[PDB]
Structures are given as structure tokens and as C-alpha cells.
Amino acid sequence: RCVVNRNGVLETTINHFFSRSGLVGVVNLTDGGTDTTGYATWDIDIMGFVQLRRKCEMFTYMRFNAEFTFVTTTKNGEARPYMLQYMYVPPGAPKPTGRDAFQWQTATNPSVFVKLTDPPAQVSVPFMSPASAYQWFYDGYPNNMMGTFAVRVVSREASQLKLQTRVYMKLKHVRAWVPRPIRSQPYLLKNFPNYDSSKITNSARDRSSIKQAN
């Protein structure tokens, strides 16, 4: 066709640019026998996947609330009605060390008790930074930002299933400051913007001549 009309001005705001329920982490649970693993923790970092990391390294400062949705499946896929405990560990509180340790019975670690046959779990985490905004680019010399996230199967004895949880993160109420360019070189590490000195990828694919329209 030929789009002569003007488009919409609501899909370009920062709040719309970030607010959408996206997949952010995948946690594997085993709940074994001899090898007493039992639990499976997952530190909160939005830089996990390379799809939101490229969108959040576009800005220097950000400020947002988060909504976490927990979708737990089994190995084959069937959902038997077992009780599950999700636990949010605030920044500074110690991580749980065992399946039946005393960090699970601690009252100041907010837990969610939900079954496999239930709708998936959904919690909201507020702005929990000591500064006024988050910042991924810290130029200088000085651990943890948002909190740890554990999960176990509530039972007296030990179950014989292995689970597989998906932590879907949605952002809300996001504000940004000091935009910066979009990174073209591929990633090498998780917490560092290291590129490769050899094999610098050009940000524009090649053509034959400068006097053409390829």
C-alpha cells in the first residue's frame, strides 16, 4: 500500500517500550535422593538474556517496579497437585543452604505457597536500591542489586520428581535518564562490556561500489 496517514504516538514512550511480560529466567529443580539438592535458587538480574540487555544498555539510569510470574512444569508436562514454596530473599539476607534449613522458616523472607495445578504465581517487587536509580555502567572501583529467589517443594519426606520453572519478568513504572548509543559488537561476558579486538564487526553490511544503490 501507501501509508499516507500518521501512525500512533503511544507505542514510542519509554513506559510502553519496556512494559510487557517477557521471559527472563529458567530454573531447573531436581529434588533427588542421595544427592540432596532439593532447592534451586535464582539471583535476580535483568541482564540475563541478550534481548533485554541491549534495550537496557541504551539508557544510563533506570527506575522501575517489577512483576514476576512463575510457570512451573514437570519433565514430561503433567501437573500433579504438589505444594510449592517460592521465596524472595531481600538484598543482605543470606541465601538458603539446604532443602530443610532455617532460611526457609525465616519469617522476614516472604513466601508464596502455590500448587502445580493452580494458575501460575505472580508477585510484585518494588524499587529496592539505596540510590535514586539503577545504573549498569559504573565507572570506578567499589555485589547484589535486587534480591535472590529460591524455590522448593513443600513436603515432609522427599518427592521423586524434577521440575522446571520459568520466571517471566514484566517491568512497570519505568523511568530512564541519560540515553547512550546501542551496542553493535557481540557480547563476551555477563557483567562486562568486553568486545573482541580482532574481528571487529562492521555496523553496516558491505556493497560493491559507492556509486550504486545496493
Binding site: 504516538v9 507505542e11 514510542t12 510502553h16 538474556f49 541478550v50 541491549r54 557481540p186
Partner: protein
């Protein structure tokens, strides 16, 4: 297109080789619709 109207005239003691930087941006008329993920990233 960018054409060579007259010629690059130059006095002595001056290099006859220069460059042109081309820049580009949008306007107040520029508007976007239907958000979607990019494909510059290859890894996942």
C-alpha cells in the same frame, strides 16, 4: 545522489583531497507503530 557540479579547485601548498561527513535524522512528522524485537542480535 551527490554530483560534482564544477570541480575541486585548490591553491598551492594545500592538499587536493578532502572528505564529506553525511549525517541523518528524523523530523517531527516521523511516527512509528507495531512494536517488535530486533534481529541485530544473533546469540540468545
Amino acid at each position: 545522489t551527490l554530483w560534482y557540479q564544477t570541480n575541486y579547485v585548490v591553491p598551492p601548498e594545500t592538499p587536493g583531497e578532502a572528505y564529506i561527513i553525511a549525517m541523518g535524522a528524523a523530523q517531527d512528522n516521523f511516527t512509528l507503530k507495531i512494536c517488535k524485537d530486533t534481529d541485530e542480535v544473533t546469540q540468545q
